[PDB]
Ligand binder design. Structure first.
Ligand SMILES: *[C@@H]1O[C@H](CO)[C@@H](O[C@@H]2O[C@H](CO)[C@@H](O)[C@H](O)[C@H]2NC(C)=O)[C@H](O)[C@H]1NC(C)=O
Ligand SMILES: *[C@@H]1O[C@H](CO)[C@@H](O[C@@H]2O[C@H](CO)[C@@H](O)[C@H](O)[C@H]2NC(C)=O)[C@H](O)[C@H]1NC(C)=O
Ligand code: NAG
Ligand code: NAG
Ligand code: NAG
Ligand code: NAG
Ligand code: NAG
Ligand code: NAG
Ligand code: NAG
Ligand code: NAG
Ligand code: NAG
Ligand code: NAG
Lengths: 211, 318, 375
């Protein structure tokens, strides 16, 4: 709210539509002042002075010019209308995918990871407020593709293996939350000879301490 | 407009004023198109907050990106593939051409930044800060993203890197063997060139006048007669110019739609991993790399394609 | 700035770049070149002839290799009719022709109106016809104070073609004797010029913007020596717009190239008038040495903006990587694409977020347009 109140250009996208159509109408009206080769731009002034065999000639010029001016206007409105239609279709798509759901499309519902969106009504348009999750305050960790334990290669089920310089932990990828590496958060596939960059650590089996 | 129709003839210019604002409208419509063209370029390429650089040591676990990264020993810092793409693809009648705001070098720099970003930090730089990750680990994440376990990547890392490297080499060889490959970009160039030549040739038409040349009319006839002949040329030339502008507005709309699609692909194929079928090529999308091209963008889409299937007996439950 | 205000029909101007006018180099002098021809054209041999032919068998005199002064006839007070078609009677001396043909015959006063293009009647159809696309002048006078049996064709199977002369006398299943007598001379105006009006020549000037007239061909432009291999019969070349881009000088037989005088769009770079009334002007595709803080760019010649080495975010775009801004005065610079960032890539190094922030951003889209209706 504070941002919008401080930036007059924020709604330029909506104002541009208003200004373009207003300009088109004023241009169309001003063309009525053109004589297009006629003695006058005003039909009443032609008719009050000339008889039909002469009046029709002057009128013909005004009809040609005015019809051409109107055709130009309509053609431009059809082209502009197509652009507006495309925008409305995009807005409708965003309503369905950003407001009525959670999107996985990058930058479709704003920068960062999309959480949710809220629509707001605006003159001749729609404004979307996009709520996103943005990672912050990253830290440098040492990593490895796998852990070697008792001759087997262990891979993370959901996260990534990291080291703080002395101990290895497994953490979720988008938020640092180190956990002890156990058989319940890793899986085994093959031996320790195949994986490049495999490191030696201990994988804890949460049975034997009780059994 | 004024020069195209009347040249430097005063008598014609004064008659042209009787038609009102038609020249103002035409000059304005073309200006609007010209502005859009820079907007289109910016939307596609300027999607990165920072200009990212690659490391001095290109160790990506066997993955070779030398054909997509800039070649430092070239005036243009273009990649080997970009260099190929670039090599492969009026004035005195009032028709001129304005330069783009973003030059070819500047566009190449944006592309380089996007490549450095995706190679060293995956998709993280497209959402927030760039977070470094080993390239083979990034690929393992991309395998999980298509329903393939990460050990498949690690246990076949040399094979995967070799197939990747081979496929890139074949892109350069493929493009060098197929002149029609860039037809989509060449068609745009040819259509606009044809439109301009048509517009100029119309100046040779008399449109019912004694002559197509205003100077020849003016050197022979007095105003009460000269104006009649000029009127015919103004009508014809104004109509020819209006036809040109209308066609450029329609064509511009098509280009805008293409640029919007290109921008969408940049965001969803290059700055992330897509789940949309055939949006980022055939097969299961792993990642994409942009390359700069004349008046356009080329995407190299890297996909996973299943091979050598076998027949098994199945059951819904045990 | 005032020009920009008038262009935009407002007393205020927003920040930006506007095209308001056009630059054009004006000509300094007029170069006139005609063939060197000494003798006067034998118009008098037709006009002051003792005898004129009958209308059914009109005579034709060819005028060639001469100077055609038509002011002697125009101002000559003697004629009743002096009507020109396609040309003006007072501009004839500034014209050159491939040929001039003077047709002459005797008519009655009531046929005078038939000696014109687009006419019908006994003379227009059977004796003397002019084409609808006629170029020339019809000159006629009352000669009853000078002057016999003259004939016209009364019957024919079909009408005559333009400039046809049928003098046969076959029986029609044709000629009749001729209310004042009139004498008519028609000057038909038809490659290198053969007949030119008095117009004196001037010295040839090259490498300057001049007006010119070469053997009747006019235009404005800069003349330079041509390297075009004209054949011995060629006088001028033509462009795709059917304009002349080279001529053969009618006296020296030198081939000259014609390059139109420098011109280009003019745009004004300005901060909003709420901040400053200072402006910079860009001459599009114009060289700064032709235009008369001067910075030559690919876009054109930018005057009034100070070029600096510091790169900033683009404000008012100029083109080709150049932008301008108000920082006070107007400056020009190469735009920045953003700050550089070297990612600490290593084969065993990963960065993981230890915190996060919740961000809210705004996206604005048009949905609808005013529903206008025009009767
Ligand atoms: C990355 O790939 C390039 C080829 O795209 C390799 O360069 C080629 O190396 C061979 C020798 O094996 C030469 O015959 C070619 O002429 C080279 N081509 C080019 C364009 O340089 C490059 O060596 C590879 N880099 C790594 C680290 O494997
Ligand atoms: C999976 O497919 C790949 C690609 O065809 C096979 O790798 C090739 O194996 C042959 C035979 O040993 C070699 O000559 C080729 O040079 C290998 N290609 C590459 C890129 O390395 C691989 O062996 C297949 N794996 C299985 C289990 O069938
Ligand atoms: C990681 O270490 C590099 C030095 O190699 C440093 O430039 C970078 O800022 C560090 N990143 C973090 C998140 O601490
Ligand atoms: C790593 O984490 C363990 C467990 O909290 C701690 O005892 C150890 O000191 C940490 N090592 C470093 C280098 O911070
Ligand atoms: C990483 O690079 C170093 C050389 O600096 C090398 O000794 C090490 O084996 C490499 N590790 C991996 C996983 O590639
Ligand atoms: C792990 O320990 C084994 C001995 O059990 C040794 O042979 C192997 O080289 C070690 N690997 C690493 C990465 O330290
Ligand atoms: C599966 O068996 C069918 C025969 O019923 C055969 O046509 C098909 O090719 C086999 N598919 C594979 C992958 O072997
Ligand atoms: C014919 O002679 C008359 C009388 O001298 C003169 O006025 C006129 O100009 C001459 N016309 C021509 C065509 O020589
Ligand atoms: C005609 O002009 C040409 C070109 O200037 C010159 O070479 C020639 O001597 C002139 N001839 C006469 C008869 O004056
Ligand atoms: C002109 O600038 C002043 C100072 O920043 C500002 O307060 C004022 O609103 C501006 N007026 C307009 C029309 O922009
Ligand atoms: C401008 O003209 C000069 C010659 O005076 C030339 O050296 C320079 O390259 C030209 N610059 C442009 C942009 O045409
Ligand atoms: C910009 O740097 C160049 C050296 O590359 C120097 O010659 C020029 O004078 C500098 N201009 C300004 C405004 O500092």
């Amino acid at each position: 709210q504070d941002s919008l109140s401080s930036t007059p250009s924020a709604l330029g996208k909506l104002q541009d539509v208003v200004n373009q159509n207003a300009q088109a109408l004023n241009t169309l009206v001003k063309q009525l002042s053109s004589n297009f080769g006629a003695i006058s731009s005003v039909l009443n002034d032609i008719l009050s002075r000339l008889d039909p065999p002469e009046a029709e000639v002057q009128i013909d010029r005004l009809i040609t010019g005015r019809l051409q001016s109107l055709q130009t206007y309509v053609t431009q409105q059809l082209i502009r209308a197509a652009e507006i239609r495309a925008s409305a279709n995009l807005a409708a798509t965003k309503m369905s995918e950003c407001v009525l759901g959670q999107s996985k499309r990058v930058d479709f519902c704003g920068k960062g990871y999309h959480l949710m969106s809220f629509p707001q009504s605006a003159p001749h348009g729609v404004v979307f407020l996009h709520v996103t999750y943005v990672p912050a305050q990253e830290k440098n960790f040492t990593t490895a593709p796998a852990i070697c334990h008792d001759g087997k290669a262990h891979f993370p089920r959901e996260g990534v293996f990291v080291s703080n310089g002395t101990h290895w932990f497994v953490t979720q990828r988008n938020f640092y939350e180190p956990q002890i590496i156990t058989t319940d958060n890793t899986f085994v596939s093959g031996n320790c000879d195949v994986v490049i960059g495999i490191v030696n650590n201990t994988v804890y089996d949460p049975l034997q301490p009780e059994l | 407009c004024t020069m195209y129709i009347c040249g430097d003839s005063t008598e014609c210019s004064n008659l042209l004023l009787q038609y009102g604002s038609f020249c103002t409208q035409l000059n304005r419509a073309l200006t609007g198109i010209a502005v859009e063209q820079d907007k289109n370029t910016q939307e596609v390429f300027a999607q990165v907050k920072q200009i990212y650089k690659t490391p001095p040591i290109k160790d990506f676990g066997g993955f070779n990106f030398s054909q997509i990264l800039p070649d430092p020993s070239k005036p243009s810092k273009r990649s080997p593939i970009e260099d190929l793409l670039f090599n492969k693809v009026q004035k005195f009648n009032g028709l001129t051409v304005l330069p783009p705001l973003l030059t070819d070098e500047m566009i190449a720099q944006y592309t380089s930044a996007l490549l450095a970003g995706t190679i060293t930090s995956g998709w993280t730089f497209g959402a927030g800060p760039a977070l470094q990750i080993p390239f083979p680990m990034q690929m393992a994440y991309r395998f999980n993203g298509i329903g393939v376990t990460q050990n498949v990547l690690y246990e076949n890392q040399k094979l995967i890197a070799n197939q990747f490297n081979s496929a890139i080499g074949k892109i350069q060889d493929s493009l060098s063997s197929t002149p029609s490959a860039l037809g989509k970009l060449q068609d745009v160039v040819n259509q606009n060139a044809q439109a301009l030549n048509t517009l100029v040739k119309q100046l040779s038409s008399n449109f019912g006048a004694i002559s197509s040349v205003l100077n020849d009319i003016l050197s022979r006839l007095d105003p009460p007669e000269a104006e009649v002949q000029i009127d015919r040329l103004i009508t014809g030339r104004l109509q020819s110019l209006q036809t040109y502008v209308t066609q450029q507005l329609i064509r511009a709309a098509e280009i805008r739609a293409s640029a919007n699609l290109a921008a969408t692909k940049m965001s969803e194929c290059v700055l992330g991993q897509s789940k949309r079928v055939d949006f980022c090529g055939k097969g299961y999308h792993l990642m994409s790399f942009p390359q700069s091209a004349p008046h356009g963008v080329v995407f190299l889409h890297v996909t996973y394609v299943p091979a050598q299937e076998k027949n098994f007996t199945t059951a819904p439950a045990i | 700035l005032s020009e920009t205000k008038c262009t935009l029909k407002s007393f205020t101007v927003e920040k930006g770049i506007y095209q308001t006018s056009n630059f054009r180099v004006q000509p300094t002098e007029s170069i006139v070149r005609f063939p060197n021809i000494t003798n006067l054209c034998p118009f008098g041999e037709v006009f002051n002839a003792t005898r004129f032919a009958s209308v059914y068998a009109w005579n034709r005199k060819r005028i060639s290799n001469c100077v055609a002064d038509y002011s002697v006839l125009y101002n000559s007070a003697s004629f009743s009719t002096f009507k020109c078609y396609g040309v003006s009677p007072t501009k004839l001396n500034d014209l050159c022709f491939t040929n001039v043909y003077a047709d002459s015959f005797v008519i009655r006063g009531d046929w005078v109106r038939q000696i014109a293009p687009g006419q019908t009647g006994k003379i227009a159809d059977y004796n003397y016809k002019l084409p609808d696309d006629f170029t020339g002048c019809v000159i006629a006078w009352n000669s009853n104070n000078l002057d016999y049996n003259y004939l016209y064709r009364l019957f024919r199977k079909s009408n005559l073609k333009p400039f046809e002369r049928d003098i046969s006398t076959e029986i029609y299943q044709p000629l009749q004797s001729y209310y004042q007598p009139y004498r008519v001379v028609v000057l038909s105006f038809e490659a290198p010029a053969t007949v030119c009006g008095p117009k004196k020549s001037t010295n040839l000037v090259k490498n300057k913007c001049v007006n010119f007239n070469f053997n009747g061909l006019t235009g404005t432009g800069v003349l330079t020596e041509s390297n075009k291999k004209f054949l011995p019969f060629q006088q001028f070349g033509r462009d795709i717009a059917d304009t002349t881009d080279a001529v053969r000088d009618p006296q020296t037989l030198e081939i000259l190239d014609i390059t139109p005088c420098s011109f280009g769009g003019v745009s004004v770079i300005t901060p909003g008038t709420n901040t400053s009334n200072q402006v910079a002007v860009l001459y599009q595709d114009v060289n700064c040495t032709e235009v008369p803080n001067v910075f030559q760019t690919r876009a054109g010649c930018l005057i009034g903006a100070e070029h600096v080495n510091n790169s900033y975010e683009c404000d008012i775009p100029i083109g080709a990587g150049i932008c301008a801004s108000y920082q006070q005065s107007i400056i020009a610079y190469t735009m920045s694409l953003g700050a550089e960032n070297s990612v600490a890539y290593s084969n065993n190094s990963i960065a993981i977020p230890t915190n996060f922030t919740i961000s809210v951003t705004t996206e604005i889209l048009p949905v609808s347009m005013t529903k206008t209706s025009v009767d």
